Design a protein around this nucleic acid. Structure first.
Ligand SMILES: [Zn+2]
Ligand SMILES: [Zn+2]
Ligand SMILES: [Zn+2]
Ligand SMILES: [Zn+2]
Lengths: 72, 74
DNA sequence: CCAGAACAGAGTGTTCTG
DNA sequence: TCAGAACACTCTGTTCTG
């Protein structure tokens, strides 16, 4: 019931990992797209519902470390 | 040499709300003071604020504005 | 149930003005 | 001079569709 990325209420298993709908589309957009993501911190940034917009670099790292896969 | 924003280090357009700043930090500060927002640092509150990363942490950005002396009083 | 599309909002940064 | 209004943009998030 809890997104393994941001801790928000999960909508199901997306791309191999239990996640919220916001993290689902964020991950796909991050993989397929082109951005400039740069951590302003130490790359330990806290990712939760309120702060997940703060550091997409760390959020995307968490997605990957959680094992999210587009071909899953 | 161009003038430098004391908040994010971008090119400064002049002195805004008491401090030499870029236009983006000018309008960011006004909106932060007047508005209701959720600003919580995801870091240690030491976050780097520059032109590229200034959008990352409005909490640290606002802190820098205040520490630089920005105010609406004059 | 889930992927992707369609739709919509938050926050930002610029130009324009007196 | 600098403060304010307002538009357009990016990144984001929810509802809809197959
Ligand atoms: Zn999530
Ligand atoms: Zn980070
Ligand atoms: Zn600035
Ligand atoms: Zn911060």
């Amino acid at each position: 019931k809890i997104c393994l990325v941001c801790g928000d209420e999960a909508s199901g298993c997306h791309y191999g990992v239990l996640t919220c709908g916001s993290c689902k589309v964020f991950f796909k957009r991050a993989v397929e797209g082109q951005h400039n993501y740069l951590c302003a911190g130490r790359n330990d940034c806290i990712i939760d519902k309120i702060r997940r917009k703060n550091c997409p670099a760390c959020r995307f790292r968490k997605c990957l470390q959680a094992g999210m896969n587009l071909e899953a």
